Write a protein that binds this ligand. Structure first.
Ligand SMILES: [Ca+2]
Length: 1086
């Protein structure tokens, strides 16, 4: 069909030029291909050596051109200059930040072919059929663990692969023994057949009212008995309630659509029992009614003040508000996900063009024309409804004319200049503002010059902006004395220092086969087999094994040994300064390559060595070890140190059990790790060696967010810099602080005296240590990286000591600020901020155009029993923007449900933060396919509704919902251990409906678990506004609740009967094959 030809042609491959993301790597030439078996894009180092490839499913957008970071980085040097019609970039990822791949071709036709083929492949693979998706998943999981396509995987490989997909295998020789190698141990067909057999057998305990009633359960393992068409014809009418099942033709079409098989297409379609059970979970059985995913033009004709428009704040950023970078990719992603309100913060630019960055903060600056271009490029790709640009300006006034001119010229007709209806008493409906962009700014008053009227912004409370001077200075480490970075802010009379912030953007010895020292002469000869012969008893070396290490009889050489025909030969490697070579063998530049070379050529005198062997006695030599150690001493050393995170390992009396003692929140915790032969485990998780365990946990969390960081030994305590030795000011809480939760201490400048230290500081040279003469034994040494900064900080601090506070009021009342320009202020026609007056609510003196802004703090004083009712009448006619308080330096969001129910529309969030409010915001907009606009229910638009009074609901029909979860399938992994999942259900809404109920937790099963029956009853008084949320938590060995997957749905558009619930991730991105099965019943008016 003129497309398969294109796909197969693309399968051939082509030679592209890759521009690496990292600056160090030079642009290079590679070979690219598309694999249609698993729908992958694969590039190879050479002709057929693949380097990792990517999945077509994750492709989020394809853009032709060179607008990417790598090209701009390399655009300077005139050696790899790109061309506007010979390069493109691929965007992929499942997070807010999208990874990019920058490619260059040789001709335009080649690029056109590639882009068209990839677009079509992505479109086809997106909406596939469940059996096809399962087949592709099997193919990927099989080949990925198969370096070649020979389709050969051993028993150990199958066991490990099963262990890697959240399913333990305690049944030795589990289930079946079809062949058991009685060359390919498990072919693809055998793999798929066994997969379906297991997925059916392990999930047979769930009892259904119709599946097992068809004279089934006789005992046949394959259960060839196929469900007839008529039984489905009746069932779909009985339980599911699909009226479409009345006609046989529609049912038959459904059968064919789900099946997608030609051989069975021509004879009375049927389902086998396994296929039926799999169909239960399929998206075709999804509880969410896909019919609602469209956008109804009827529900887009109300005044704009009613819709719960999306929003975001601090878009240019991509992380914490203090040191995160700024990029246009954030703007693109936010506009794509379905946002309609974004904020711009402008500052004076060196060349007359502003730069967008956070005021008085270490935020990387970006240009303005580039931001405008990105806005124009990604404005109406995901919708056709207006977007509002709120501008925060701090620039000059000539910069204001420049901004206005650039905006007009670039945006052309898309920018508003006239109002749709001057005489209209309400904001025009969204349909009237299709393909438009609104501009929001402080606006100029009816007078002249800078003017807002009150100017009395009396908040003026501590923050990153209203400070004497901020910056990043290092602090010493009492244990090992490393100058980690910290955040310093100089306030009027106090300073604040935060917790460490690490947030940012040999080979032969480390080799597994490298055993290190073994003995001295004869011991090495005999000990060599002592660590191998006793090891191979586990499984047995296939065609022998090998071991190599430093040679004993030959100093400066390595001895090579290998088991062969009941003999362990001894060899030597001649290391001559540098081309290492064996006896009468080709030279090799390194030992690592010397051994590897033998593993490629088929040395089968030529011996080919098998897989290497891991080592065990590697933890003993390390410092963090104690052969003998009792509890009391354990916690004594653990509490001796002043920092939290210290860890150590100790022996335990019963064999093969060790303990890890660590510190957290000023408390001791002990974790028991068991050992068995060639395995270790603190729980369901499995690790090869204790050294491997610590290394994995040295860079990954173990308990809560703590990370093993300080290895503790008597020497470390002896060299301890200071731990409250010989009253300090560590302090706690102090919530009302500039640094929100990041605060770690406080100090008062007036009582401090400053003395510079132009002396031999440890590896530092810019020090202005602070001393406390009032209380002896205090020295707050602070380092820096330049001479000028040290002087600037010191001078500012000294002024504080003799400041002699004389400011008129708290944080000043502001003064001549920007001299607002006419050009920039002329554009705004809607959404012009003004002060908030309570008396105007409900009167004839309030205009619909004006809005107001709340930093969640003056807002939390309106969402209450006394003010909720009055505040509700305000959002009916006017808008109201709510943004997070300045104290939140982690970008943490806030629960907006009270704000939404109260009627506020533009509830801005922080998209970069994957937290519960963001998930709720994403879920709420499902009604419309993320079009960005959702209409308010009819109940909230009545004169008697009250957000905090059940009886006020009047004549709304209540609802009673009965839920019973049967089981899960394909739960994602978390860390290394096997998840012990429990699914908790929650109803969210008003304060008088919110509730949560949790089930029990299954042990060591996450691939297909089923829970004991326990019907759940829920009651809702306001079905129109509610949210049903399933969260699959895991019960770790520390009795804590971690996050695996979530699924939130509005209650309005839900089906009945037996249903499947697809899962997602914390970022609201669909998972693959993960879902739940439930029985749901609704009893309206009962
Ligand atoms: Ca701002």
């Amino acid at each position: 069909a003129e497309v398969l030809h294109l796909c197969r042609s693309l399968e051939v491959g082509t030679v592209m030029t890759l521009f690496y993301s990292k600056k160090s790597q030079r642009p290079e030439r590679k070979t690219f291909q598309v694999k249609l078996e698993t729908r992958q894009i694969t590039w190879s180092r050479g002709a057929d050596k693949i380097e990792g490839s990517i999945d077509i499913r994750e492709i989020k957008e394809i853009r032709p051109g060179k607008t990417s970071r790598d090209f701009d980085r390399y655009q300077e040097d005139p050696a790899f200059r790109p061309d506007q019609s010979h390069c493109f970039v691929i965007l992929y990822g499942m997070e807010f930040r999208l990874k990019t791949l920058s490619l260059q071709a040789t001709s335009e036709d080649e690029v056109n072919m590639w882009i068209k083929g990839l677009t079509w492949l992505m479109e086809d693979t997106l909406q596939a059929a469940t059996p096809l998706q399962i087949e592709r998943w099997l193919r990927k999981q099989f080949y990925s663990v198969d370096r070649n396509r020979e389709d050969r995987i051993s028993a150990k490989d199958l066991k490990n692969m099963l262990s890697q997909v959240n399913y333990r295998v305690p049944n030795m020789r589990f289930l079946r023994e079809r062949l058991t190698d009685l060359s390919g141990d498990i072919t693809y067909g055998q793999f798929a057949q066994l997969y379906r057999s297991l997925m059916y057998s392990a999930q047979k305990t769930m009892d259904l009212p119709f599946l097992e009633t068809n004279t089934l359960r006789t005992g046949e393992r394959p259960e060839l008995c196929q469900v007839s068409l008529s039984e489905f014809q009746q069932f779909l009418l009985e339980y599911q309630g699909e009226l479409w099942a009345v006609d046989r033709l529609q049912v038959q079409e459904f059968m064919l659509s789900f099946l997608r098989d030609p051989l069975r297409e021509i004879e009375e379609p049927y389902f086998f029992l396994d296929e039926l059970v799999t169909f239960l979970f399929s998206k075709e059985n999804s509880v969410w009614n896909s019919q609602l995913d469209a956008v109804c033009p009827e529900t887009m004709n109300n005044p704009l003040s009613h819709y719960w428009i999306s929003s975001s704040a601090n878009t240019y950023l991509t992380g914490d508000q203090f040191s995160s970078e700024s990029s246009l990719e954030a703007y693109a992603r936010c506009l794509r996900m379905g946002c309609r309100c974004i904020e711009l913060d402008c500052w004076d630019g060196p060349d007359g063009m502003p730069v967008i960055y956070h005021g008085h903060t270490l935020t990387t600056k970006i240009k303005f024309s580039d931001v405008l271009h990105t806005i124009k490029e990604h404005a109406f790709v995901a919708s056709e409804y207006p977007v509002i640009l709120s501008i925060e300006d701090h620039c000059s006034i000539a910069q204001q004319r420049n901004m206005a001119q650039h905006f007009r010229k670039v945006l052309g007709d898309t920018l508003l200049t006239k109002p749709v209806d001057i005489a209209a008493d309400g904001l025009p409906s969204p349909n009237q503002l299709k393909r438009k962009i609104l501009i929001k700014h402080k606006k100029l008053a009816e007078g002249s010059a800078y003017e807002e009227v009150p100017t009395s912004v009396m908040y003026s409370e501590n923050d990153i902006s209203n400070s004497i001077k901020n910056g990043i200075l290092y602090l010493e480490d009492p244990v090992n004395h490393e100058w980690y970075p910290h955040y310093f802010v100089l306030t009027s009379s106090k300073i604040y220092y935060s917790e460490e912030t690490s947030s940012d953007q040999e080979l032969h010895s480390s080799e597994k086969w490298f055993h290190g020292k073994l003995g001295a002469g004869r011991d090495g000869r005999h000990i060599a087999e002592r660590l191998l012969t006793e090891y191979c008893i586990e499984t047995g070396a296939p065609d022998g094994s090998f071991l190599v290490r430093e040679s004993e009889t030959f100093v400066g050489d390595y001895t090579l040994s290998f088991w062969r025909n009941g003999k362990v030969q001894h060899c030597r490697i001649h290391s001559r300064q540098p081309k290492f070579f064996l006896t009468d063998n080709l030279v090799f530049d390194s030992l690592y390559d010397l051994i590897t070379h033998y593993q490629q050529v088929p040395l089968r005198f030529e011996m080919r060595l098998s897989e290497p062997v891991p080592q065990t006695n590697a933890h003993e030599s390390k410092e963090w070890y104690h052969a003998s150690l009792t509890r009391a001493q354990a916690e004594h050393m653990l509490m001796r140190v002043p920092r939290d995170g210290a860890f150590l390992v100790r022996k335990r009396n019963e064999p093969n059990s060790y303990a890890i003692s660590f510190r957290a929140e000023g408390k001791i915790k002990h974790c028991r790790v068991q050992q068995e032969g060639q395995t270790v485990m603190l729980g369901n998780s499995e690790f090869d060696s204790l050294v491997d365990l610590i290394s994995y946990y040295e860079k990954h969390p173990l308990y809560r967010k703590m990370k093993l960081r300080y290895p503790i030994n008597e020497e470390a305590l002896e060299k301890i810099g200071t731990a409250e030795p010989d009253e300090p000011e560590r302090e706690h809480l102090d919530e009302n602080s500039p640094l929100g939760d990041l605060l770690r201490g406080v100090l008062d400048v007036p009582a401090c005296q400053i003395a510079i230290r132009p002396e031999g500081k440890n590896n530092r040279l810019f020090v202005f240590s602070i001393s406390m003469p009032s209380v002896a034994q205090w020295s707050l040494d602070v380092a820096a990286d330049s001479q000028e900064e040290l002087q600037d900080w010191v001078k500012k601090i000294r002024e504080v000591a003799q400041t002699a506070d004389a400011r008129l009021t708290e944080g000043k009342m502001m003064e001549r600020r920007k001299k607002i320009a006419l050009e920039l202020s002329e554009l705004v026609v809607y959404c012009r901020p003004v002060p908030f007056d309570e008396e105007k609510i409900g009167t004839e003196r309030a205009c619909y155009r004006d809005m107001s802004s709340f930093p969640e703090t003056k807002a939390e004083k309106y969402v209450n029993k006394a003010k909720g009712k009055k505040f509700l009448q305000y959002n009916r006619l006017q808008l109201s923007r709510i943004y997070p308080k300045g104290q939140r330096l982690d970008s943490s969001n806030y629960d907006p449900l009270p704000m939404w129910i109260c009627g506020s529309q533009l509830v801005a969030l922080n998209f970069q933060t994957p937290d519960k409010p963001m998930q709720m915001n994403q879920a709420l907009f499902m009604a419309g396919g993320h079009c960005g606009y959702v209409l308010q229910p009819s109940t909230m638009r009545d004169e008697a509704f009250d957000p905090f009074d059940k009886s006020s609901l009047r004549g709304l029909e209540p609802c009673v919902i009965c839920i019973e979860v049967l089981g899960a399938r394909h739960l994602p992994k978390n860390g290394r251990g096997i998840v012990c999942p429990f699914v908790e259900i929650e109803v969210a809404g008003a304060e008088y409906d919110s509730t949560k109920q949790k089930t029990e937790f299954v042990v060591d099963n996450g691939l297909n678990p089923v829970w004991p029956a326990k019907p759940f009853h829920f009651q809702i008084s306001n079905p129109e506004f509610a949210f049903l949320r399933f969260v699959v938590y895991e019960e770790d060995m520390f009795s804590d609740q971690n996050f695996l997957a979530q699924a939130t749905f509005p209650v309005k558009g839900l089906k009945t009967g037996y249903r499947a619930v697809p899962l997602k991730n914390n970022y609201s991105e669909d998972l693959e094959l993960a879902s739940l099965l439930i029985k749901i019943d609704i009893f309206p008016a009962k």
